[PDB]
Design a protein around this ligand. Structure first.
Ligand SMILES: [Cu+2]
Ligand SMILES: [Cu+2]
Ligand SMILES: [Cu+2]
Ligand SMILES: [Cu+2]
Ligand SMILES: [Cu+2]
Ligand SMILES: [Cu+2]
Ligand SMILES: [Cu+2]
Ligand SMILES: [Cu+2]
Ligand SMILES: [Cu+2]
Ligand SMILES: [Cu+2]
Ligand SMILES: [Cu+2]
Ligand SMILES: [Cu+2]
Ligand SMILES: [Cu+2]
Ligand SMILES: [Cu+2]
Ligand SMILES: [Cu+2]
Ligand SMILES: [Cu+2]
Ligand SMILES: [Cu+2]
Ligand SMILES: [Cu+2]
Lengths: 296, 296, 296
């Protein structure tokens, strides 16, 4: 796109503030930002806030979100579809023109780990170029295993294709498949979908801990066979809904856009790969690491 | 196939009649019928009854089906495999020669939303050319959420490949991925798998309604990541079995041949896309629309 | 690999012995063995014990496994990752050099049907060349439907690609997709992943029996839409964990590495195909047969 040549808009922080016991304001940008997706490979991504996947959103069950999208892209319209919300897509997930803002309000009625993404046609183009992310809706009554959890992180799986190539997006295998992590608490890492960061800078934990991961596969096109090497999931909540409880799973199948809360125990010191067992995708980047030490 | 050149057999209605409190007669054809799968693209499909996917079958749990297949194809044998039934495949799902009929009897013991398809070798060829469909078996005791449902429809996902091309069928990406709808009540739409009908003529509903969809992904080759934009599934019954209850799912993973009953609320007026979140498939046709109005 | 030219190491039996009420010794080889994966097609597989998938391992819930790998490969290191166990991957799933042995100990805390596979980088290469298999961990308290089961077998799904071709492994469609069966009791068949054995020598059963299959899809890359033609699964336990109970499923979605226990009734004499309903894969080999007779 001629108007994107040389454009690299610095990342902008997510803005969130609570405005009532059940109402929250969220402000995000659409922007065009260079991201290193593999060593030596820059992708001039279409993003929310200069991150791909975008910044984490966390709200409580029953919160109404008053969402503003500020479109920094000089030429392409953008939009937002939160899978957490009940909304009229033709009224509430509509386009915001370049250099404009739009505000939309809708409730997050349902607990879980939801995809969000741009909803502008062609949606495949917007998602594949980077406009995806996760919103977590915390359950009013928690999960039954909350008291057992020692530490928690968020991990997101996505693919990357040939740059802005709709043929490839439709018809081609992914060039890379990758994990990222998005921060829940101060000091947690906050990374973009790339082949290397979570190998070189593993997630950290302590021997004996029960770890919870909030996970989502944003696609755009592939399913995920999510597995932590050297453990078994004690408990799994599909889509993060407390009612969708499974136990003792080796691997969690996630559709495109599918989420889960998964919990597992790390019994011994060492480094534990986190993979999709679709090993062509693992080979193409989709391995993260969890370093487990006597201290954490 | 030389004997198919110029053949376009007009669609024939499904024939069904109940013959006892737990016995039903069903009569279907195998026939060769031109279907417009995308604008300007005719596929000379191999079909049941001139529809692809084929006509909807609905029976009750515990019904024995006395099924007749009348093979109108001038040269290729055809057969029927209902995933609802208990049967001997080598006796009951056998071929019917051109210009012949065959009758087979078997029970539908299990509630749910089942694939049916031709079982003639090579089965991939017969399915890919269009010989697939859905049989619904209604549970004796309903679903627990029956009283909440305001409206219901059937949606089927399938792929289309290069015409009658076994190489492509085995080794190629789908050319199109599509939804169709099959009528449960008078006045419901009844459409074939194409890229456009359910966009131009959306399914209809009223503001505030809880909608039930009976869904099946007939493949032949892909899985489906089924999602209704702007809502969350309140309740999901995998394969349509009441016992396989999930709640609050954003997206339902369906294997090839996989079914579900899904229920969700439409809170606001507007048009709600229905998609597979495998967005390469959505781009290649797999988007239907639900138009929600103050009146329905 | 120059050092593999002409190498065809005869299969070696699995060695297992119980050494305590909750401790078992297991001894396996890594070895290079020619396997006929399709008629006229030899693949010089990388294997455990000269089988691909490897030999079945069965232990009890709560058993600690003291595992020895003897690496017969003259040049490539190999390793073992059991998905059943809790272990430190960087200490316990490490490489064993050519002509060396290594011993590792870890507990199998969780009931189910788990993948095992080589964990040597590149893991895709090692899995795709044949180093995969299944370990069953029997639940302390059984399954609730145990008393209903008349007969049982193990079936494994895997893919085969162009020989030792990392490009193909990453980027290509499978050349073959196949079932194998691994013996639980004397007289059961024990076969390798090939397109033909379980068609020419079907699994056997008797009219009216409830059959249990312990199943796993080891990939490396595809998901499986597992279906037995002419029946419906009465009961399904995802990953073989008794708590993950589904009923009345037509088809069981398995991720890559995913397992299940599935149970179904065969009501009539005949031959019952066992397939993945991803019919491109079925066409490329993934059909097994179950022959049901008045005597068994
Ligand atoms: Cu309140
Ligand atoms: Cu406000
Ligand atoms: Cu966009
Ligand atoms: Cu892929
Ligand atoms: Cu703890
Ligand atoms: Cu694994
Ligand atoms: Cu009666
Ligand atoms: Cu009759
Ligand atoms: Cu046919
Ligand atoms: Cu596809
Ligand atoms: Cu209502
Ligand atoms: Cu979506
Ligand atoms: Cu004891
Ligand atoms: Cu020992
Ligand atoms: Cu190896
Ligand atoms: Cu495939
Ligand atoms: Cu019995
Ligand atoms: Cu089938």
């Amino acid at each position: 796109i001629a108007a994107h040549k040389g454009v690299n808009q610095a990342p902008v922080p997510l803005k969130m503030e609570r405005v009532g016991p059940h109402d929250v304001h969220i402000e995000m940008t659409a922007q065009i930002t260079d991201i290193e997706i593999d060593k030596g490979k820059i992708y001039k991504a279409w993003t929310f806030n200069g991150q791909a996947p975008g910044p984490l959103v966390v709200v409580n069950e029953g919160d109404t979100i008053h969402f503003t999208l500020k479109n920094m892209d000089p030429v392409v319209p953008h939009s937002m579809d939160f899978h957490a919300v009940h909304a009229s897509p033709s009224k509430d997930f509509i386009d915001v023109m370049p250099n404009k803002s739009g505000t939309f309000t809708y409730p997050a009625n349902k607990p879980g780990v939801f995809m969000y993404h741009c909803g502008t046609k062609p949606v495949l183009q917007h998602i594949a170029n980077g406009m995806h992310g996760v919103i977590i809706v915390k359950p009013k009554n928690g999960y039954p295993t909350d008291k057992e959890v020692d530490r928690e992180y968020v991990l997101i799986q996505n693919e990357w294709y040939k740059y802005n190539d709709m043929n490839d997006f439709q018809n081609g295998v992914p060039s890379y498949v990758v994990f990222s992590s998005k921060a829940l608490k101060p000091g947690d890492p906050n990374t973009n979908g790339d082949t290397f960061t979570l190998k070189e800078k593993p997630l950290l934990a302590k021997v004996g801990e029960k770890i919870r991961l909030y996970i989502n596969n944003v696609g755009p096109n592939e399913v995920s066979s999510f597995h932590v090497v050297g453990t078994v999931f004690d408990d799994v909540y599909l889509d993060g809904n407390p009612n969708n409880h499974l136990q003792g799973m080796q691997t969690v199948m996630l559709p495109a856009s599918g989420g889960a809360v998964v919990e597992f125990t790390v019994t011994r010191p060492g480094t534990y790969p986190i993979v999709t067992m679709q090993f062509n995708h693992a080979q193409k980047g989709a391995v993260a690491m969890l370093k487990v030490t006597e201290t954490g």
